[PDB]
Amino acid sequence: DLRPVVIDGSNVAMSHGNKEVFSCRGILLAVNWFLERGHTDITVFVPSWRKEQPRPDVPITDQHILRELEKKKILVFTPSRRVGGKRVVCYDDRFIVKLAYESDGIVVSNDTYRDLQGERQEWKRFIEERLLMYSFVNDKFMPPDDPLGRHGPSLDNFLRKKP
């Protein structure tokens, strides 16, 4: 009925609260926005290292929310690990775009994934047609009523499989 929603968790969390802090409530607030509208196919991707005890160069707030959302089958960690002590992480954005693409859904993010546009040009097309940007005002998740500009569909229709 509604398109499947894929959220760039890191993008949303950095955007919420202080721009230099990974603010987990941002993710929760975005997820809740979709839940209250009756969505049930929602996936949030975050790299697994965000569960590790934070170092001072990677501050994070309400860290417990990530595992809480994972339990609820909303959030899914993408792979990362240390090798020779150095963090090595698998590109987040490939998971995000690839899932959204193959499920013909929506990507929630203010990142336009230029690099990935420049790989497969059906991705470039997909990202141009299915990216949902947003702003936060304090705790208020606010996506645009005109996702794709003035000549585009309303938000409500954007999120539907068919108007």
From Swiss-Prot:
UniProt region (RNA binding), positions on chain: 81-87
Family assignment from sequence similarity: Belongs to the ZC3H12 family.
Role played: Endoribonuclease involved in various biological functions such as cellular inflammatory response and immune homeostasis, glial differentiation of neuroprogenitor cells, cell death of cardiomyocytes, adipogenesis and angiogenesis. Functions as an endoribonuclease involved in mRNA decay. Modulates the inflammatory response by promoting the degradation of a set of translationally active cytokine-induced inflammation-related mRNAs, such as IL6 and IL12B, during the early phase of inflammation.
Taxonomic classification: Eukaryota, Metazoa, Chordata, Craniata, Vertebrata
Domain RNase NYN stretches: 2-157
UniProt: Mg(2+) binding residues: D93
Segments traversing the membrane: none
Name the UniProt record assigns to this protein: Endoribonuclease ZC3H12A
Result after altering D8N: Loss of pre-miRNA RNase activity. Attenuates strongly miRNA silencing activity. Loss of interleukin IL17A and IL6 mRNA instabilities. Reduces angiogenic differentiation
Illness the protein is tied to: Increased expression of ZC3H12A is associated with ischemic heart disease.
Native source species: Homo sapiens (Human)
Assembly with partners or alone: Oligomer. Found in a deubiquitination complex with TANK, USP10 and ZC3H12A; this complex inhibits genotoxic stress- or interleukin-1-beta-mediated NF-kappaB activation by promoting IKBKG or TRAF6 deubiquitination. Interacts with IKBKG; this interaction increases in response to DNA damage. Interacts with TANK; this interaction increases in response to DNA damage and serves as a bridge to anchor both TANK and USP10 into a deubiquitinating complex. Interacts with TRAF6; this interaction increases in response to DNA damage and is stimulated by TANK.
RNase: annotated span: 1-163
Domain-level remarks: The C3H1-type zinc finger domain and C-terminal region are necessary for pre-miRNA binding. The C-terminal region and proline-rich domain are necessary for oligomerization.
Tissue: Expressed in heart, placenta, spleen, kidney, liver and lung. Expressed in leukocytes. Expressed in monocyte.
Domain of life from the UniProt record: Eukaryota
Effect on the protein upon substituting D92A: Loss of pre-miRNA RNase activity, IL17A mRNA instability and antiviral effects
Cellular compartment(s): Nucleus; Cytoplasm; Cytoplasm, P-body; Rough endoplasmic reticulum membrane
Effect noted on mutating R81A: Abolishes RNase activity
Expression induction: Up-regulated by the transcription factor ELK1 in a interleukin IL1B-dependent manner through activation of the NF-kappa-B and ERK signaling pathways. Up-regulated by chemokine CCL2 in endothelial cells and in peripheral blood monocytes. Up-regulated in activated T lymphocytes. Up-regulated by phorbol 12-myristate 13-acetate (PMA) in primary T lymphocytes. Up-regulated by interleukin IL17 in keratinocytes. Up-regulated by lipopolysaccharide (LPS). Up-regulated by tumor necrosis factor TNF-alpha and interleukin IL1 in acute monocytic leukemia cell line THP-1 cells.
